Amino acid sequence: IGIRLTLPPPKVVDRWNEKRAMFGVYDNIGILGNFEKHPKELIRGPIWLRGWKGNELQRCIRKRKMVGSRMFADDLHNLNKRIRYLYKHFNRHGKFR
Amino acid sequence: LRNRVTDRYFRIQEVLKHARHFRGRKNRCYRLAVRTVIRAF
């Protein structure tokens, strides 16, 4: 059917462990540190999208203009494909016109 | 998903348990149940 059969694995999760303990510690970095470095650098994440959060089409546009010459050919053709798709997607057919 | 539709057997048993006194194949399945039970209420 569509249910489980027994009670599932017991969710051993310590909500108070170290790798979550400092979650945002030293993360008011800018005005609480005499303006040396903004929070706009403290994020450890991909350089395609580290803090210019536009739309989906914008997301891909930034991915291209940042790292396109660093992809295998499948990713380049893929990013080009969806970029063409989205450029057609924005201004063609929708609810508000 | 980031969440799939998990409450089905509870939903269907909420559906069919107010019409379990019928006859024919509609004693069982949700589509026949909804049609006849809706008519009956």
């Binding site: 249910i3 489980r4 009670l7 | 057997y9």
Partner: peptide, 26 residues
């Protein structure tokens, strides 16, 4: 294969009621 921890408990409660109705204890 719903990744979830509650609806299981709901179905377990229903099945336990079914077990009670299966043969009531002395």
């Amino acid at each position: 294969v719903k990744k979830g921890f509650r609806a299981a408990f709901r179905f377990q409660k229903e099945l336990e009621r079914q077990r009670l109705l299966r043969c009531p204890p002395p």
